Each structure stands twice: as structure tokens, then as C-alpha cells.
Design a protein around this ligand. Structure first.
Ligand code: MG
Ligand code: MG
Ligand code: MG
Lengths: 175, 175, 175
């Protein structure tokens, strides 16, 4: 199964959905799905002594304006390996700009993680968590001389609307 | 290749056989094969501060009464990653009951591990190893309020008979 | 996608090319691509207390006299996981003999690693690095009672010629 096209989004979408992990919490390696093959590839090694703050990946059968599936950061107890998928609930949305292009990220929790599965909104999180996440995306390409502006987080309903829209775009631009 | 259906069981089956690893020794993440896609998914994060005592997975082209392929715990020197497979010899069988349902596990060694490849029966193992394994399966779902009873281990020939039966069930219930 | 057959070698071949990693830097597990299925398998656990000095794998759509794709050792900042691929530049060639059979290895860097992407020849590396690499391949099967002779390293152009030849052999012996 191709993890973008063949894996189902999950019956509970857009509220709950599968996430294919590309990058493990704590990693300096920026892995990405290779869209053509469905394999995981090294896009690059980060140019700063920084690491992804949480597991990170994408939602199957979604599509954004950047021609990628929608991105998700998944808060949970444990590191998850690239290429594996998990079930997640959207709890907030982080709008941002990467060199003039929209690049919004979903903030989610794993619904099968007994510690985090009961979160439904990012306002429930310790605020430092949000501060660290925002700072990561403002920092992680600085040493590539690439400009990343991050805006204020939005609530879970904004995230759910983003997911739904990306489902629609995928369904439209398929065949 | 779908790792359940397309990967061969191995010429030496039922005595020696491929094992597709789902969970690495030391992990708190309960990964599982997603039967439909052949991808590895997070089933859950364990609900106790426990970890899998050994690499853990399943045998291709097998089927049990629980509609899953047969489960195998593989004793060896080194952690193995989810989605990779290895060659194993069955050396014992651990019968158990998960909430009233049969859920027996094969105890095996990796035949390509110079340290463990010469084991042919669980009675050859340091007995604590068996004690820790049994205790793990009695413990690991307790905090999910799920009941798991584990019975006395059986010899390698009982394990080989279990494997063979699960080969037969797979061959029957295919097409 | 089958990682040997279906993944492209990369537009820049033979100078720059995809590498599918089989073994992570620091590993004692000798993983290998299973040619038939495209899955990663445990070939064996190394028989000495040694570990791979760098990430290690193969180039898609190549073929050598040993009926395997050509082998590559990839020098870079970070460990890469089995089954993932990356973009690499050939910077040298290590000729060797494994029990009377040719088994030459490419020495490469990851072109997406900001630290190493500017290397074009192995003479640019700290010489100890070459000493450690050579010694690894002279050591790692000793305890299997298998004989491995390693010869003097050759420059990047020798590596590029090896890659190109292995591309040709693959194209010939396909269908
Ligand atoms: Mg993305
Ligand atoms: Mg199972
Ligand atoms: Mg090889």
C-alpha cells in the first residue's frame, strides 16, 4: 500500500484520522514521504542543532496548495518510527509562512495514547508546549537562510476545517 | 510485497520460518501489522510502565482463530526494527487467555544470531527468562482493565504443531 | 514501490544517486534488502563486537557480478533508518575480496547534509576515517572464519566508473 493514496484516512475523518509519521520526536533528520514511490526519503539533515519537538507526518488522502498532503505534529508519550501510522485527533492549528508560501500545521494527539487521548483542544496543553513548538518552526530553517513566520495558534475547530478542506482538494484532484 | 501474504513462510517451515517484527525489544509502543494495507500501525501506547521483553511479531502465511497470523517472541542479541523480517526457530509455546480468547505465543530464537541459533528448546534457557516473559504478558494490559491468564510453557514440539496448524488454516481460508 | 527496481536511480547518476539504506551507523545487525520482496531482512547478527562505521546500503537499478546492487557506505552527520533512501555523491571506491569474490564498496556522502555535501573526494577526509572503514571490513567477518582482503582506496572517478558499469549491467540483465 502507498501510504498517501492507498491507506484510508480513517472512518472518523476529519475529526479523527490516520497520520503517517515521517519524523520521530527528537530527530535531526528531516525525512519526507517520497510522493512517487511511497518510500521515506531523507530530504535533508537540519542545518541547526535543533530537533523535531514531536512526532511529525502527514494525513493520507489529503492535499494542500503546496501539492503535499496536510502536515501534522502529534503530541504523545513515545517516539514513533518513520513509515508507521497512528490514529490522531486534531486539537489545534498553527498557521505559518515559509518563504511567502502557506504551510499551516495541524497540532494533534494520538487517540490510542492513554495519557493524551483525552485532549480536545490546544488550550488544555501546558502553554510552554505551544511556545516550544512555535519556536521550533521559527528556528529550524534559519541557518538555511529561509524565512519562516509563525502566527498565533487557532482552536481545534479551525484545525478540523483545514483537514476537511484538504480532503476535498484531494478528492477533486484525483483522476 | 505485503508482509503477511506475499512474503514466503520460509522453506524450513514449520520448524524454521520467517518472522515479521512488529515491536522492538524494549519498546512501550505496541505496533501491529495493519492487515489491509500491510503497513505497521500504532495500536496503542502500553498503559503501564512496561516494555516488550524481546522482539515480537508474526509469521507470514499463518492464521489463528483470532483472525490474526500467529504471534512470535524472538529471543536474540539485538533489537530489530518494525517491518523487518528475520529467520527463526520455534523452541517453545506459551499458552494464554486474553479476556476469554485464546492468544498463545510462540517462543523462538533467531537462527542467524550466533549466540542463540543453537537453542532448540525453552528448557535450555535461563529460567528467569521464562519467568520475565510470563510476567510481562500477565502485566501489560492490567491497567487497561483487561484480564490475561498465562499457563505453563510447552516444549518446542508443541510450538511446531501450533505453527503447522496455523499454516493449514491460512491455506484453507485463502480464496 | 520495490526499492531496487521501482525507485529511480536519480537524475544525476552516476555522479549523484539515490541510496537505499539497509544498515544504520552504529548497528550490529546486518540487515539486507530481500531482493524478491523488497522488504528489509536480518541477514545475521555480526559475529564480533563491531558496528557499522557509517550508514550503509545499495543503489537502485544497479547490478554487480555478485548478482546484488552496488554497495555504498554513506558518511554523514546522522543515523539513517533501514528502508529509507537518501541522495549521495560518490567520493571514493574501496576494492575488496570476500572469500575470493569481488565485493567493492562505494564511499559516498549525503548531498543533503550541510556538513558533508561539499566533499568530492576521499582524500579530503580525515585519514583516520579511511583507516577505520578499511579496518571494519577486514574485521567484521573474522569470527565467521571468512577471509576478507581490502585493497587501497581509489579516487572518486574510479567510484563513478564502478557505478556506471553497474547501471549498464542492470539495464542489460533486465527482461
Ligand atoms: Mg509535509
Ligand atoms: Mg499478533
Ligand atoms: Mg549489498
Amino acid at each position: 500500500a502507498h501510504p498517501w493514496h492507498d491507506l484510508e484516512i480513517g472512518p472518523g475523518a476529519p475529526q479523527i484520522f490516520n497520520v503517517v509519521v515521517e519524523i520521530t520526536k527528537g530527530s535531526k533528520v528531516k525525512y519526507e514521504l517520497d510522493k512517487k514511490t511511497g518510500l521515506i526519503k531523507v530530504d535533508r539533515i537540519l542545518y541547526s542543532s535543533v530537533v523535531y519537538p514531536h512526532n511529525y507526518g502527514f494525513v493520507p488522502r489529503t492535499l494542500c496548495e503546496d501539492n503535499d498532503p496536510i502536515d501534522v505534529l502529534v503530541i504523545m508519550q513515545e517516539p514513533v518510527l518513520p513509515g508507521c501510522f497512528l490514529r490522531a485527533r486534531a486539537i489545534g492549528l498553527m498557521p505559518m509562512i515559509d518563504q511567502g508560501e502557506k504551510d499551516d500545521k495541524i497540532i494533534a494527539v494520538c487517540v490510542d495514547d492513554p495519557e493524551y487521548k483525552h485532549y480536545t483542544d490546544i488550550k488544555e496543553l501546558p502553554p510552554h508546549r505551544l511556545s516550544e513548538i512555535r519556536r521550533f518552526f521559527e528556528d529550524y530553517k534559519k541557518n538555511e537562510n529561509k524565512e519562516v513566520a509563525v502566527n498565533d495558534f487557532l482552536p481545534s475547530e479551525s484545525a478540523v476545517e483545514a483537514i476537511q478542506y484538504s480532503m476535498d482538494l484531494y478528492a477533486e484532484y484525483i483522476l
